[PDB]
């Protein structure tokens, strides 16, 4: 069907599964709900259906009180991501509660611990460790804030975070990027010479390319990193696409090792690549010929990873559960779950960006 049809089916399925008080982890401000609700608000923009806006707003209002107060994990980049929902909520409502909450999250950057060259630790509990996922958790928010409040120092901050991750985790051979880097070389997964984790884990690279694809347009005009991030996205997408599965159109949990019998096709990473490829084409960062890769991914996604239940629920399966930096055997051993929120968010976002290219296919 058309991308938005599946996006609405998944969103309504999950909205029917959980009240906002249940949306897991329940009564917590966290990126799982933040990425799902980014999706639902994108869907609201695409369709104009107010129920999508209202559900997102109700989660925000569950967690943020009359004075803008919010409880969250104060050492985690992960806590910052859900702040992305605050910008459309504020824009629609002008309710200063949302800007107040946003400023609480933005104020976190100055409190977090850092590697020697300034890269944020993923959490206090992960000292000297940068994980690719954190570019999505902390980067787009910062640039939205920068534009809302005209704080150019946040442009500089995201430029630095990204350059450090790319400097330390990009593999020149494949062009893929390792999941995490430990400057201290204290974790068991840290390579003794480079500090990197050993594998290309699909979702983490997915968050990175989604981030680049979304952040370029938030930079000032003529900002030097417009060129840099475009170039970076182009090469990353070329690298990723080389590993697309020829039979299903999808990508593997461990991107470069799809021949391994204990590897498997994973949905959230695949949807993130679809998002970044569609977004890149839509914005002109990527050659339009990537549309075939994209539509092939779309066909396999639906065919192999989705279904409707006897009771009518739309199900996206084989989404990796929450996963840390680690080894091959740990990654391929991760639980494969259905309709997990970060994967549902990636699915819904992918569909909204795919919709225009689907509509115009052939023209
Ligand atoms: C420290 C630890 O491993 N905590 C577990 C959670 O992992 C953290 O949460 C996230 C995330 O997606 O929420 C991913 C990383 O694994 C890590 O930062 C999580 O895996 C959990 C089950 O949801 O169990 C915790 O013990």
From Swiss-Prot:
Location in the cell: Cytoplasm
InterPro entries, per the entry: 6-hairpin_glycosidase_sf, 6hp_glycosidase-like_sf, Glyco_hydro_88, PolySaccharide_Degr_Enz
SUPFAM superfamilies: Six-hairpin glycosidases
Residues under site feature: May be essential to modulate pKa of the D-143 carboxyl group: 31, 78
Catalysed reaction equations from the record: 2-O-(4-deoxy-beta-L-threo-hex-4-enopyranuronosyl)-alpha-L-rhamnose + H2O = 5-dehydro-4-deoxy-D-glucuronate + L-rhamnopyranose
EC number, UniProt record: 3.2.1.172
One annotated GO molecular function: unsaturated rhamnogalacturonyl hydrolase activity
Effect of substituting residue 133 to N: Loss of hydrolase activity
One of the record's GO cellular component terms: cytoplasm
One of the protein's GO biological processes: carbohydrate metabolic process
Chief place where the protein resides: cytoplasm
Activity sensitivity to pH: Optimum pH is 4.0.
Keyword rRNA-binding set for record: no
Keywords recorded for this protein, A-Z: Cytoplasm, Glycosidase, Hydrolase
Catalytic residues (positions): 133 (proton donor)
Temperature dependence, free-text field: Optimum temperature is 50 degrees Celsius. It is stable below 50 degrees Celsius.
Record Pfam families: Glyco_hydro_88
Binding annotation for substrate: 30-31, 78, 122-126, 203-207, 323-324
Entry function: Catalyzes the hydrolysis of unsaturated rhamnogalacturonan disaccharide to yield unsaturated D-galacturonic acid and L-rhamnose. It cannot act on unsaturated glucuronyl hydrolase (UGL) substrates containing unsaturated D-glucuronic acid at the non-reducing terminus, although the active pockets of YesR and UGL are very similar.
Matches recorded under PANTHER family: UNSATURATED RHAMNOGALACTURONAN HYDROLASE (EUROFUNG)
Subunit structure: Monomer.
Stated name of the protein: Unsaturated rhamnogalacturonyl hydrolase YteR
Source species of the chain: Bacillus subtilis (strain 168)
Lineage summary: Bacteria, Bacillati, Bacillota, Bacilli, Bacillales
Gene this chain is encoded by: yteR
């Amino acid at each position: 069907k058309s991308p938005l049809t599946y996006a609405e089916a998944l969103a309504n399925t999950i909205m029917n599964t959980y009240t906002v008080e249940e949306l897991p982890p329940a009564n917590r401000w966290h990126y799982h709900q933040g990425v799902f609700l980014c999706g639902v608000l994108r869907l609201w923009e695409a369709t104009g259906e107010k129920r999508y806006f209202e559900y997102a707003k109700a989660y925000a209002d569950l967690l943020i009180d009359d004075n803008g107060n919010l409880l969250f994990r104060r050492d985690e980049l992960d806590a910052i991501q859900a702040g992305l929902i605050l910008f459309p909520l504020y824009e629609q409502t002008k309710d200063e509660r949302y800007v107040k909450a946003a400023k609480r999250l933005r104020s976190l950057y100055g409190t977090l611990n850092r590697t020697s060259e300034g890269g944020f630790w993923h959490k206090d509990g992960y000292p000297y460790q940068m994980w690719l996922d954190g570019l999505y958790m902390g980067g787009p928010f910062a640039l939205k804030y920068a534009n809302l409040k005209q704080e150019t120092e946040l442009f500089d901050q995201v430029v630095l975070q990204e350059s450090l991750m790319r400097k330390h985790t990009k593999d020149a051979k494949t062009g893929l990027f390792y999941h995490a880097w430990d400057e201290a070389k204290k974790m068991p997964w840290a390579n003794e010479e480079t500090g990197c984790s050993p594998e290309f884990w699909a979702r983490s690279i997915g968050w990175y390319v989604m981030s680049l694809a979304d952040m370029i347009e938030e930079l000032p005009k003529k900002h030097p990193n417009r060129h840099v991030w475009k170039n970076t996205l182009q090469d990353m997408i070329k690298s990723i696409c080389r590993y697309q599965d020829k039979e299903t159109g999808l990508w593997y949990q461990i991107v470069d090792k799809g021949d391994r019998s204990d590897n498997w096709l994973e949905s959230s990473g695949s949807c993130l690549y679809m998002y970044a490829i569609a977004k890149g084409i839509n914005k002109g960062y990527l050659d339009r010929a990537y549309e075939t890769t994209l539509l092939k991914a779309y066909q396999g996604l639906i065919q192999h990873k989705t279904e409707t239940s006897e009771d009518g629920a739309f199900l996206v399966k084989d989404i990796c559960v929450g996963t840390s930096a680690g080894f091959y055997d740990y990654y391929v051993s991760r639980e494969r779950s259905t309709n997990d929120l970060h994967g549902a968010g990636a699915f819904i976002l992918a569909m909204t960006e795919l919709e225009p290219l689907f509509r115009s296919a052939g023209k």
